[PDB]
Coordinates of C-alpha atoms in Angstrom, one line a residue:
Chain A
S1 CA 142.4 92.4 83.3
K2 CA 139.2 91.1 83.8
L3 CA 139.1 93.4 87.3
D4 CA 138.8 96.4 85.4
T5 CA 136.4 94.9 82.7
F6 CA 134.5 93.9 85.6
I7 CA 134.5 97.4 87.3
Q8 CA 134.1 99.1 83.9
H9 CA 130.5 96.9 83.3
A10 CA 129.4 97.5 86.9
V11 CA 129.4 100.9 86.8
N12 CA 127.3 101.0 83.2
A13 CA 125.4 97.9 84.6
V14 CA 123.0 101.0 85.7
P15 CA 121.8 104.8 85.0
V16 CA 124.2 106.0 88.5
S17 CA 122.9 109.1 90.2
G18 CA 126.2 111.4 90.9
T19 CA 124.1 112.9 94.0
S20 CA 123.7 109.1 95.0
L21 CA 127.0 107.6 94.5
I22 CA 129.0 111.0 95.6
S23 CA 126.5 110.0 99.1
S24 CA 127.5 106.5 99.2
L25 CA 131.6 107.8 99.2
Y26 CA 130.6 110.0 101.9
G27 CA 129.0 107.4 103.8
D28 CA 131.3 104.6 103.6
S29 CA 135.0 106.4 102.5
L30 CA 134.6 109.8 104.6
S31 CA 131.8 109.4 107.9
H32 CA 134.8 108.2 109.6
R33 CA 137.6 110.5 108.5
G34 CA 136.1 114.2 109.7
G35 CA 133.4 114.2 106.8
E36 CA 135.1 116.9 104.6
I37 CA 137.2 116.4 101.3
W38 CA 137.9 118.6 98.4
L39 CA 136.0 119.0 95.2
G40 CA 139.4 118.2 93.6
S41 CA 139.7 114.9 95.6
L42 CA 136.3 113.7 94.4
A43 CA 137.1 114.6 90.9
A44 CA 140.7 112.2 91.3
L45 CA 138.6 109.7 93.4
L46 CA 135.9 109.2 90.3
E47 CA 137.8 110.2 87.3
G48 CA 139.2 106.5 86.7
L49 CA 135.4 105.4 86.7
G50 CA 134.8 107.9 83.8
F51 CA 132.8 110.5 85.6
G52 CA 134.6 113.9 84.6
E53 CA 134.4 117.0 86.9
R54 CA 131.6 118.7 85.7
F55 CA 129.7 115.6 87.0
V56 CA 131.1 115.8 90.0
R57 CA 130.4 119.4 90.4
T58 CA 126.9 119.0 89.6
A59 CA 126.5 116.3 91.7
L60 CA 128.0 118.4 94.8
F61 CA 125.9 121.1 94.1
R62 CA 122.7 119.3 94.2
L63 CA 123.2 117.2 97.1
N64 CA 124.1 121.2 99.0
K65 CA 121.0 122.0 97.3
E66 CA 119.2 119.1 99.0
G67 CA 120.9 119.7 102.6
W68 CA 122.9 116.9 102.5
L69 CA 126.5 118.6 102.1
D70 CA 127.8 122.0 103.3
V71 CA 130.8 123.6 101.5
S72 CA 133.5 126.0 102.3
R73 CA 135.4 128.0 99.9
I74 CA 138.7 128.4 101.4
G75 CA 141.5 130.2 99.1
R76 CA 141.0 128.8 96.0
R77 CA 139.3 125.6 96.7
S78 CA 135.7 124.3 97.5
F79 CA 135.4 121.6 100.4
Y80 CA 132.1 119.6 100.8
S81 CA 131.5 118.3 104.5
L82 CA 128.7 116.6 105.8
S83 CA 125.8 118.9 106.7
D84 CA 123.8 118.2 110.3
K85 CA 121.4 116.6 108.3
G86 CA 123.5 114.3 106.0
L87 CA 125.1 113.3 109.4
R88 CA 122.2 112.3 110.9
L89 CA 121.5 110.3 108.0
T90 CA 124.8 108.8 107.4
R91 CA 124.6 107.9 111.2
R92 CA 121.2 106.1 111.1
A93 CA 122.0 104.2 107.2
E94 CA 125.7 103.2 109.4
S95 CA 123.1 101.1 111.8
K96 CA 121.7 99.2 108.6
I97 CA 124.9 98.9 106.7
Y98 CA 127.0 97.8 108.8
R99 CA 125.2 96.1 111.4
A100 CA 126.0 93.0 113.4
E101 CA 122.9 92.2 113.5
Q102 CA 119.3 92.4 114.8
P103 CA 118.5 92.4 118.4
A104 CA 116.0 90.0 119.9
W105 CA 112.9 90.5 119.1
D106 CA 110.5 91.4 122.1
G107 CA 107.4 90.3 119.9
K108 CA 105.8 93.3 120.4
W109 CA 104.3 95.3 117.4
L110 CA 103.3 98.8 117.1
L111 CA 99.8 99.4 115.3
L112 CA 98.4 102.7 113.7
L113 CA 94.8 103.6 113.0
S114 CA 94.4 106.8 110.8
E115 CA 90.9 107.6 110.7
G116 CA 89.0 110.6 111.7
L117 CA 90.5 112.8 108.9
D118 CA 89.5 112.1 105.3
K119 CA 92.1 110.1 103.2
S120 CA 93.8 113.0 101.1
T121 CA 96.3 113.8 104.4
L122 CA 95.4 109.8 105.2
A123 CA 97.8 109.2 102.2
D124 CA 100.5 111.7 103.4
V125 CA 100.9 110.2 106.5
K126 CA 100.9 106.7 105.5
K127 CA 103.7 107.0 103.2
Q128 CA 105.8 108.7 105.8
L129 CA 105.2 105.9 108.2
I130 CA 106.2 103.7 105.2
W131 CA 109.6 105.8 104.7
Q132 CA 110.1 104.8 108.6
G133 CA 109.8 101.3 107.8
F134 CA 106.0 100.3 108.3
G135 CA 103.9 97.7 106.4
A136 CA 100.5 98.5 105.2
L137 CA 98.6 95.5 107.0
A138 CA 95.0 97.1 106.1
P139 CA 94.3 100.3 103.9
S140 CA 94.0 102.5 107.5
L141 CA 96.7 100.6 109.7
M142 CA 100.1 100.6 109.6
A143 CA 102.2 98.2 111.5
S144 CA 105.6 98.2 112.4
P145 CA 107.3 94.9 114.7
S146 CA 110.4 97.0 115.2
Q147 CA 109.5 100.5 115.8
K148 CA 107.7 102.1 119.0
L149 CA 105.4 105.2 119.8
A150 CA 108.7 107.0 120.6
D151 CA 109.6 106.8 117.2
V152 CA 106.0 108.2 115.8
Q153 CA 105.1 110.8 118.3
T154 CA 106.8 113.8 117.0
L155 CA 106.3 112.5 113.5
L156 CA 102.3 112.5 114.3
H157 CA 102.2 115.9 116.0
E158 CA 103.4 118.3 113.1
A159 CA 101.6 115.8 110.7
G160 CA 98.8 117.5 112.5
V161 CA 97.2 114.2 113.1
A162 CA 98.8 113.4 116.7
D163 CA 95.5 112.5 118.6
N164 CA 93.8 111.3 114.9
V165 CA 95.6 108.4 115.0
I166 CA 94.7 105.0 117.4
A167 CA 97.8 103.2 118.3
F168 CA 97.9 100.1 119.6
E169 CA 100.8 98.1 121.4
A170 CA 99.7 94.7 120.4
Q171 CA 101.1 90.8 120.6
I172 CA 100.2 87.7 118.8
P173 CA 100.3 84.5 120.9
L174 CA 100.1 82.1 118.4
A175 CA 103.7 80.6 117.3
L176 CA 102.1 77.3 115.6
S177 CA 101.0 78.8 112.3
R178 CA 102.0 81.8 110.7
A179 CA 101.5 80.6 107.5
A180 CA 98.6 83.4 106.8
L181 CA 100.5 86.3 108.6
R182 CA 103.4 85.9 107.1
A183 CA 102.2 85.5 103.9
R184 CA 100.6 89.0 105.0
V185 CA 103.7 90.5 106.0
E186 CA 105.6 89.7 103.1
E187 CA 103.2 90.8 100.2
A188 CA 102.7 94.1 102.6
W189 CA 106.2 95.1 102.7
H190 CA 107.1 93.3 99.2
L191 CA 109.3 91.2 100.8
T192 CA 109.5 89.3 97.1
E193 CA 110.9 92.3 95.6
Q194 CA 113.3 93.0 98.4
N195 CA 114.7 89.1 97.9
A196 CA 114.7 89.7 93.9
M197 CA 116.8 92.7 94.7
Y198 CA 119.5 91.0 97.5
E199 CA 119.3 88.3 94.6
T200 CA 120.7 90.5 91.6
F201 CA 123.1 92.0 94.0
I202 CA 124.1 88.4 94.7
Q203 CA 124.5 87.5 91.0
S204 CA 126.5 90.6 90.0
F205 CA 129.1 90.5 92.5
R206 CA 129.6 87.2 93.2
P207 CA 132.2 86.7 90.1
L208 CA 134.4 89.3 92.0
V209 CA 135.3 86.9 94.8
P210 CA 137.4 84.3 92.7
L211 CA 138.7 87.4 90.7
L212 CA 139.8 89.4 94.1
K213 CA 141.9 86.1 94.8
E214 CA 143.2 85.7 91.2
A215 CA 144.2 89.3 91.3
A216 CA 145.0 89.8 94.4
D217 CA 148.7 91.2 93.7
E218 CA 147.7 93.3 91.2
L219 CA 144.7 95.3 92.6
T220 CA 145.8 98.5 93.0
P221 CA 144.4 101.2 95.7
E222 CA 142.5 102.8 93.0
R223 CA 141.0 99.6 91.7
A224 CA 140.4 98.6 95.4
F225 CA 138.7 101.9 96.0
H226 CA 136.3 101.9 92.5
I227 CA 135.5 98.0 93.8
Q228 CA 134.6 99.4 97.5
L229 CA 132.4 102.0 96.1
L230 CA 130.6 100.3 93.9
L231 CA 130.1 97.5 95.9
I232 CA 128.8 99.5 99.0
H233 CA 126.8 101.9 96.7
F234 CA 124.8 99.0 95.0
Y235 CA 124.6 97.3 98.2
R236 CA 123.6 100.4 100.1
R237 CA 120.5 100.9 97.9
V238 CA 118.8 97.5 98.3
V239 CA 119.8 96.9 102.4
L240 CA 118.2 100.9 103.2
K241 CA 115.0 100.0 101.6
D242 CA 114.9 96.8 103.3
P243 CA 112.3 97.1 106.5
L244 CA 114.7 94.6 108.3
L245 CA 111.9 92.5 110.0
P246 CA 112.9 89.8 112.4
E247 CA 114.1 86.7 110.8
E248 CA 110.6 84.8 112.7
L249 CA 108.8 86.3 109.8
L250 CA 110.7 86.2 106.6
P251 CA 110.1 84.1 103.8
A252 CA 111.8 80.6 104.2
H253 CA 114.6 81.4 101.8
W254 CA 116.1 85.1 102.7
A255 CA 118.7 86.1 100.4
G256 CA 119.6 88.7 102.6
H257 CA 122.2 86.8 104.8
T258 CA 124.1 85.7 101.8
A259 CA 124.1 89.0 100.4
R260 CA 125.5 90.5 103.8
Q261 CA 128.0 87.5 103.7
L262 CA 129.3 88.6 100.3
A263 CA 129.7 92.1 100.8
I264 CA 131.2 91.5 104.1
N265 CA 133.9 89.0 101.8
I266 CA 134.6 91.7 99.3
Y267 CA 134.6 94.6 101.4
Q268 CA 137.7 92.9 103.9
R269 CA 139.5 92.1 100.9
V270 CA 139.4 95.7 99.4
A271 CA 139.0 98.4 102.3
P272 CA 142.9 98.1 103.2
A273 CA 144.1 99.3 99.7
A274 CA 141.1 101.4 99.0
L275 CA 141.8 103.6 102.4
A276 CA 145.2 103.9 101.0
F277 CA 143.7 105.4 97.9
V278 CA 141.6 107.7 100.3
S279 CA 144.5 108.6 102.1
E280 CA 146.7 109.5 98.9
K281 CA 143.9 111.5 97.0
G282 CA 142.0 113.2 99.7
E283 CA 142.7 116.3 100.5
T284 CA 141.6 119.5 103.6
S285 CA 141.7 123.0 103.9
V286 CA 144.8 121.9 106.0
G287 CA 146.3 118.7 104.3
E288 CA 145.6 114.9 104.6
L289 CA 142.5 113.3 105.9
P290 CA 142.7 111.8 109.7
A291 CA 143.0 108.4 109.9
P292 CA 139.8 106.3 109.8
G293 CA 138.0 106.2 113.3
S294 CA 137.8 102.9 115.6
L295 CA 133.8 103.1 114.6
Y296 CA 134.9 102.1 110.6
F297 CA 137.0 98.9 112.1
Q298 CA 133.8 97.8 113.9
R299 CA 132.0 97.8 110.1
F300 CA 130.3 94.3 109.8
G301 CA 131.6 93.1 113.8
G302 CA 134.9 93.7 112.9
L303 CA 137.5 94.3 109.9
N304 CA 140.2 92.1 110.0
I305 CA 143.3 94.7 109.4
Chain B
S1 CA 41.7 102.6 132.3
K2 CA 44.7 104.6 130.9
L3 CA 46.6 100.8 131.5
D4 CA 44.4 99.2 128.5
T5 CA 45.0 102.3 126.3
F6 CA 48.7 101.8 126.6
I7 CA 48.5 98.1 125.9
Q8 CA 46.6 98.7 123.0
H9 CA 48.5 101.8 121.6
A10 CA 52.1 99.8 122.0
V11 CA 50.9 96.9 120.4
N12 CA 49.1 98.8 117.4
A13 CA 51.9 101.3 117.2
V14 CA 54.2 99.0 114.5
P15 CA 53.6 95.8 112.9
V16 CA 54.4 92.9 115.1
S17 CA 56.4 90.1 113.9
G18 CA 54.3 86.5 114.9
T19 CA 57.8 84.8 115.2
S20 CA 59.6 87.5 116.9
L21 CA 56.8 87.8 119.7
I22 CA 56.2 84.2 120.0
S23 CA 59.9 83.7 120.4
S24 CA 59.9 86.6 123.6
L25 CA 57.5 85.0 125.3
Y26 CA 59.1 81.1 124.8
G27 CA 62.2 83.2 126.0
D28 CA 60.9 84.7 129.1
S29 CA 58.0 83.2 130.2
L30 CA 58.9 79.6 129.2
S31 CA 62.2 78.8 129.1
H32 CA 62.4 78.1 133.0
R33 CA 59.1 76.3 132.9
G34 CA 60.0 73.2 131.4
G35 CA 59.7 75.2 127.4
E36 CA 57.3 73.6 126.3
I37 CA 53.1 74.7 125.8
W38 CA 50.2 73.6 124.0
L39 CA 49.2 75.9 121.1
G40 CA 45.9 76.5 122.5
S41 CA 47.6 77.8 125.7
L42 CA 49.3 80.2 123.7
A43 CA 46.4 81.6 121.7
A44 CA 45.0 82.4 125.1
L45 CA 48.2 84.1 126.8
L46 CA 47.8 86.1 123.6
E47 CA 44.4 87.0 122.2
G48 CA 43.6 90.0 124.5
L49 CA 46.5 91.4 122.8
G50 CA 44.3 91.2 119.6
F51 CA 46.4 88.1 117.9
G52 CA 43.8 85.4 117.0
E53 CA 44.8 81.3 115.9
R54 CA 46.1 81.6 112.3
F55 CA 48.4 84.0 113.8
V56 CA 49.4 81.9 116.3
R57 CA 49.5 78.5 114.7
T58 CA 51.4 80.5 111.2
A59 CA 54.2 82.2 114.0
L60 CA 54.8 78.5 115.4
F61 CA 54.9 77.2 112.2
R62 CA 57.6 78.9 111.1
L63 CA 59.1 78.7 114.1
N64 CA 59.2 74.7 113.9
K65 CA 60.7 75.3 110.1
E66 CA 63.9 77.6 111.5
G67 CA 64.4 74.7 113.8
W68 CA 63.7 76.9 116.9
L69 CA 60.8 75.0 118.0
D70 CA 60.1 71.3 117.9
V71 CA 56.2 70.5 117.6
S72 CA 54.6 66.9 119.0
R73 CA 51.2 66.4 118.2
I74 CA 49.7 64.5 121.4
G75 CA 46.7 63.0 121.8
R76 CA 44.3 66.0 119.9
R77 CA 46.4 68.3 120.7
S78 CA 49.9 70.4 119.8
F79 CA 52.7 71.1 121.7
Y80 CA 55.0 73.5 120.6
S81 CA 58.5 73.4 122.6
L82 CA 62.0 75.1 122.5
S83 CA 64.2 72.6 120.2
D84 CA 67.7 71.9 121.4
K85 CA 68.9 74.6 119.2
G86 CA 66.3 77.0 120.1
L87 CA 67.3 76.4 123.8
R88 CA 71.0 76.7 123.2
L89 CA 70.2 80.5 121.5
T90 CA 67.6 81.5 124.1
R91 CA 70.3 81.1 126.8
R92 CA 72.6 83.0 124.9
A93 CA 70.2 85.8 123.7
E94 CA 69.3 85.3 128.2
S95 CA 72.6 86.3 129.4
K96 CA 72.6 89.6 127.4
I97 CA 68.7 90.7 128.1
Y98 CA 69.0 89.6 131.8
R99 CA 72.3 90.2 132.1
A100 CA 73.5 91.2 135.7
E101 CA 75.7 93.7 135.2
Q102 CA 78.0 95.4 132.0
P103 CA 81.5 93.4 132.4
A104 CA 84.5 95.0 133.9
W105 CA 87.0 96.0 131.8
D106 CA 90.8 95.3 131.9
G107 CA 91.5 97.5 128.6
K108 CA 92.6 94.8 126.2
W109 CA 91.4 94.1 122.6
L110 CA 91.5 91.5 120.1
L111 CA 92.4 92.1 116.1
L112 CA 91.4 89.6 113.7
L113 CA 92.5 90.1 109.7
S114 CA 92.1 88.0 106.8
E115 CA 93.2 86.8 103.7
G116 CA 93.7 84.7 100.9
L117 CA 89.4 84.7 100.8
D118 CA 86.8 85.5 98.7
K119 CA 83.7 87.2 98.6
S120 CA 81.7 84.3 100.2
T121 CA 84.6 83.8 102.5
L122 CA 84.5 87.4 103.5
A123 CA 81.1 88.5 103.8
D124 CA 80.4 84.7 105.6
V125 CA 83.1 85.5 108.4
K126 CA 82.1 88.7 108.2
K127 CA 79.0 87.8 109.1
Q128 CA 79.6 85.5 112.1
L129 CA 81.4 87.8 113.6
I130 CA 79.5 91.1 113.3
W131 CA 76.6 89.1 115.6
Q132 CA 79.3 87.8 117.2
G133 CA 79.8 91.2 118.9
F134 CA 82.9 92.0 116.8
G135 CA 83.2 95.7 114.8
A136 CA 84.3 96.5 111.5
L137 CA 87.3 98.8 113.2
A138 CA 88.8 99.2 109.8
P139 CA 88.3 97.9 106.5
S140 CA 89.9 94.3 106.3
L141 CA 89.9 94.3 110.2
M142 CA 87.6 93.0 113.0
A143 CA 87.9 94.2 116.4
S144 CA 86.2 92.9 119.6
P145 CA 87.4 94.9 123.3
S146 CA 85.1 92.1 125.1
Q147 CA 86.0 88.4 123.3
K148 CA 88.7 86.0 123.3
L149 CA 90.4 84.7 120.5
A150 CA 89.9 81.2 122.2
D151 CA 85.9 82.6 122.2
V152 CA 86.2 82.4 118.6
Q153 CA 88.4 79.7 117.9
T154 CA 85.8 77.2 117.7
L155 CA 83.9 79.4 115.5
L156 CA 87.0 80.4 113.1
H157 CA 87.9 76.4 112.3
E158 CA 84.3 75.7 112.1
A159 CA 84.0 78.3 109.2
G160 CA 87.5 76.4 107.6
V161 CA 89.5 79.6 107.3
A162 CA 91.7 79.5 110.6
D163 CA 94.7 79.0 108.1
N164 CA 93.9 82.4 106.8
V165 CA 93.2 84.6 109.8
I166 CA 95.7 87.1 111.9
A167 CA 94.5 87.7 115.6
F168 CA 96.2 90.4 117.5
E169 CA 96.0 91.0 120.9
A170 CA 96.1 94.9 121.8
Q171 CA 96.6 97.7 124.1
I172 CA 96.1 101.2 124.0
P173 CA 99.0 103.1 126.3
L174 CA 98.5 106.6 126.6
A175 CA 94.9 108.0 127.1
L176 CA 95.6 110.7 124.5
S177 CA 94.9 108.7 121.4
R178 CA 91.3 107.9 123.1
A179 CA 88.8 110.6 121.8
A180 CA 89.8 109.2 118.0
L181 CA 88.9 105.8 119.3
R182 CA 85.6 106.7 120.8
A183 CA 84.8 108.8 117.6
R184 CA 85.8 105.4 115.6
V185 CA 83.9 102.9 117.7
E186 CA 80.8 105.0 116.9
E187 CA 80.8 104.4 113.5
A188 CA 82.1 100.7 113.5
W189 CA 79.2 99.5 116.2
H190 CA 77.2 102.4 114.7
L191 CA 76.1 103.6 118.3
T192 CA 74.2 106.5 117.1
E193 CA 71.9 104.2 115.6
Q194 CA 72.1 101.9 118.3
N195 CA 71.3 105.2 121.2
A196 CA 68.2 106.2 118.9
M197 CA 66.6 102.6 119.3
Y198 CA 67.6 102.9 123.0
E199 CA 65.3 106.2 123.0
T200 CA 62.4 105.2 121.4
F201 CA 62.4 102.2 123.6
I202 CA 62.4 104.4 126.7
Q203 CA 60.0 107.2 125.0
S204 CA 57.6 104.1 124.7
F205 CA 57.8 102.7 127.9
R206 CA 58.4 105.3 130.5
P207 CA 55.3 106.5 130.7
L208 CA 54.4 103.7 132.5
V209 CA 56.4 104.3 135.5
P210 CA 53.6 106.6 136.9
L211 CA 50.5 104.5 135.6
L212 CA 51.7 101.3 137.4
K213 CA 52.3 103.7 140.7
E214 CA 48.9 104.9 140.2
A215 CA 46.9 101.6 139.2
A216 CA 48.9 98.9 141.6
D217 CA 45.8 97.5 142.4
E218 CA 44.4 98.1 139.1
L219 CA 46.5 95.9 137.8
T220 CA 45.2 92.1 136.5
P221 CA 47.4 89.0 136.0
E222 CA 46.3 89.2 132.1
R223 CA 47.5 93.0 131.7
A224 CA 50.4 92.3 133.7
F225 CA 51.8 90.1 131.6
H226 CA 50.7 91.4 128.0
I227 CA 52.8 94.8 129.7
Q228 CA 55.5 92.2 130.6
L229 CA 55.9 90.5 127.1
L230 CA 55.7 94.0 124.6
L231 CA 58.2 95.6 127.4
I232 CA 60.8 92.1 127.5
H233 CA 59.9 91.9 123.6
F234 CA 60.5 95.6 122.8
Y235 CA 63.8 95.6 125.0
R236 CA 65.3 92.3 123.6
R237 CA 64.5 93.8 120.4
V238 CA 67.3 96.6 120.7
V239 CA 69.0 95.0 123.1
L240 CA 70.4 92.1 121.0
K241 CA 71.8 93.9 118.6
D242 CA 73.6 96.2 121.4
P243 CA 77.7 95.1 121.5
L244 CA 77.9 95.8 125.1
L245 CA 81.0 97.6 124.8
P246 CA 82.6 98.7 127.8
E247 CA 81.8 102.0 130.3
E248 CA 84.8 103.7 128.7
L249 CA 83.9 103.9 125.4
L250 CA 80.2 104.8 125.5
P251 CA 79.2 108.5 125.3
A252 CA 78.0 110.5 128.4
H253 CA 74.6 110.7 126.7
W254 CA 74.2 106.8 126.7
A255 CA 70.5 106.1 126.7
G256 CA 71.0 101.7 126.7
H257 CA 71.4 102.6 130.9
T258 CA 68.6 104.3 131.6
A259 CA 66.9 101.9 128.9
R260 CA 67.9 98.7 131.1
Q261 CA 67.1 100.3 134.6
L262 CA 63.5 101.1 132.8
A263 CA 63.3 97.7 131.6
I264 CA 64.0 96.5 135.4
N265 CA 61.9 98.8 137.3
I266 CA 59.2 97.5 134.9
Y267 CA 59.9 94.3 135.3
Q268 CA 59.9 93.5 138.6
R269 CA 56.3 95.5 139.5
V270 CA 54.7 93.3 136.3
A271 CA 56.6 90.1 136.6
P272 CA 54.6 88.0 139.6
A273 CA 50.9 88.5 138.3
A274 CA 52.2 88.0 135.0
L275 CA 53.6 85.1 136.3
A276 CA 50.7 84.1 137.4
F277 CA 48.9 84.2 134.4
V278 CA 51.1 82.1 132.6
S279 CA 50.7 79.4 135.5
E280 CA 46.7 80.2 135.0
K281 CA 46.4 79.7 131.1
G282 CA 49.6 77.3 130.3
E283 CA 49.2 73.6 129.9
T284 CA 51.8 70.9 128.9
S285 CA 51.5 67.6 127.5
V286 CA 51.9 66.3 130.9
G287 CA 49.6 69.4 132.3
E288 CA 50.7 71.9 134.3
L289 CA 53.3 73.9 133.8
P290 CA 56.4 73.6 136.3
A291 CA 57.2 76.0 138.6
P292 CA 60.2 78.5 137.2
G293 CA 63.7 77.6 138.3
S294 CA 65.9 79.3 140.2
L295 CA 67.9 80.7 137.1
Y296 CA 64.7 82.8 136.5
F297 CA 64.7 84.7 140.1
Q298 CA 68.6 85.5 138.8
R299 CA 66.9 87.4 136.2
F300 CA 68.5 91.8 136.6
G301 CA 70.4 90.6 139.4
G302 CA 67.6 89.0 141.5
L303 CA 64.0 89.5 141.2
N304 CA 61.6 90.7 144.2
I305 CA 59.8 88.2 144.1

């Protein structure tokens, strides 16, 4: 069938990190269901995509070593759960991925000038801020229209640059001609790269919509779960790299909304059967997984189940 | 008399530019008295300083070629007058030199970013902004705590880059980041160099305070004028390079305040007799120099004449 052909091609299109895929699985399918599952369940969930047990074991071991998953050996079974760090990262990504969306923008920026320390600690703190969503408006000026001082105070202090950084709360009183600024942000945040990523995503998953409509009845729980996992995994790859700047600052043909709409359209079609597969396969030390909590159904502004 | 010795030492310490000296004389002594004088008057006004006719004539010729002075041959006399441009530039310089006080600060900043430009447009617009009072707070980043955007828009579009300039109105919210700011400001405006210039000026002219007290009656109009001209010439040399930053951004060991009061204390003492000397020697195309207008008497917050 064409659904399997789509699934197999999607899984083989790019090298897939086991740690990354299993993170996607936890974030999407398990975080509203207790965050814990048997290694054996994960193997059964990924077997039909061609991932064998040793691949799953190695990914889980690495995710524990990175501090993302805790593990409990109970009886003769190993159970892996989101660690405290994994929980905070998962909740953080949840806001960006499942998304209603932007609060309205107050027009205020935070600008950071990092000088009075020579430029080797500088690059360290530069990227630390970049990973937080800041763009390099200049080789010493970091900027974000979304973050505020509260979100970087802690980072600055035990980077050891707390009062070696000048912070500005700035506003721009011009709205007739942004052309030069908007260009600045586009290259500062590599928005052309980001749009291309959104746009590879759209081309990759657009054929799934007619396929799901054609094979609605042949969509088994396992195939629904594999589609959902691959969809959200590759969507999460693009969206988490998105600085999520206000619309006013984006290029005129931002594919991100189309990518989002497509993700939601596929997600709603496969989620009911996919939940059933996780329910069928998932086990903890006390048996069946919990039902998804209410936050699960609030994803994407509301799931029509 | 030690006054004559002071005058001779001051004028012979360093080469004196004729164009710069004559600009000082016009700006200080003639801009409120019709802006015009006979070449012969200038020669008589500067003779006692050791400057001869060729020095004066050559300087006037250059000031005309630069567009600072117009020249008239009327009868058999040459008259040099502030050009329309020269008058405008003199008034601008006067606001800084005779300023009645450092402006009060609201704490607000203006930040300017460029791009889509060359060498020539970059260094060019950087050129005007620097003399306009802006500092390169960071590479590619110009800043001023005092100016407008409105005060630079005529300048910016006249350069043809208004489409490539990003403007920010900025603020610093908590006084904990201020040490770093004062350090950055020091290098952006080279305040250590500026302060050293002020200290040289103070060291050169502080001895006049006791001398003028001692020889108060022995001060003739010519010597009062030569003192005033040398004082204002060397003071404007330093102060016109001063960005005149708010008090908050300068050290507690800032010599600019000492320099200004010293200039004022000497200026108030010699200005009446120096004015008498200029009236005695000055001749215009319509005869005598006019009396100084009221703006003259508002200098330094008010002249005690």
